[PDB]
Amino acid sequence: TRDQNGTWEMESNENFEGYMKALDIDFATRKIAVRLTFTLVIDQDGDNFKCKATSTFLNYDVDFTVGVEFDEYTKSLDNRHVKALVTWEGDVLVCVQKGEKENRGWKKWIEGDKLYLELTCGDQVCRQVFKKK
Ligand SMILES: *C/C=C/c1cc2ccc(N(CC)CC)cc2oc1=O
Numbered sequence: 001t002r003d004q005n006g007t008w009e010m011e012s013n014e015n016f017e018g019y020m021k022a023l024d025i026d027f028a029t030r031k032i033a034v035r036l037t038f039t040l041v042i043d044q045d046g047d048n049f050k051c052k053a054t055s056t057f058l059n060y061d062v063d064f065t066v067g068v069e070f071d072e073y074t075k076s077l078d079n080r081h082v083k084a085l086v087t088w089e090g091d092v093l094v095c096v097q098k099g100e101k102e103n104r105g106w107k108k109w110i111e112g113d114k115l116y117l118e119l120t121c122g123d124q125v126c127r128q129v130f131k132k133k
Contacts, residue, residue: 001110002091004049008040008115008130019119019126023078023101033058040115040130049086072097 017034025033036055043050047066053059060077064070064086072084074097082099093108107118119126 002088002093003044004042004093004108004110004115005044006042006115007133008042009133010037010039010128011114011131012127012129013037014127015124016119016126016128018124019121022121022124025078029058038128039133040117042115066093 017030020030020033033055036057038053038055041052041054048063049066050063052061058076062072062084064084066086066088069083069085072082074080074082080099080101082097082104084095084097086093086095088094089107091109095105095107097104101121103123104121106120107116109116113132115130115132117128117130119128
């Protein structure tokens with residue numbers, strides 16, 4: 001399915017530190033961030049997405065339209081400027097963040113009532129799995 005609407009509670013988190021280290025997140029923010037569980041709230045209407053990931057400390061907010069390139073200032077993460085583009089590869093939602101970092105982006109897909117998120121930077125791949133609340 002291409003329907004990722006929902007409130008999604010973290011079930012698994014693998015190699016979050018490696019991804020954040022690849023982004024050069026400072027040590028203290030990174031060490032706290034690796035410890036924390038996230039809820040992902042995805043508000044999707046056709047091609048229009050609003051994605052909010054919340055923890056007790058760090059936050060992530062992005063709005064986009066599938067297939068429309070946009071400037072992203074990554075800000076609360078690594079404070080960089082990228083040219084972001086979100087598209088479908090089958091039922092996998094693929095984001096490429098064009099900029100200083102290679103292989104930077106993410107992939108989101110549904111596999112049996114679970115939402116998978118892959119965060120990529122360089123040769124680092126973080127895998128997070130969420131359950132629909
Ligand atoms: C497609 C959604 C990706 C995504 C990206 C994120 C970046 C940073 C963070 N945090 C804590 C809330 C910083 C450690 C979370 C996050 O969640 C996501 O789903």
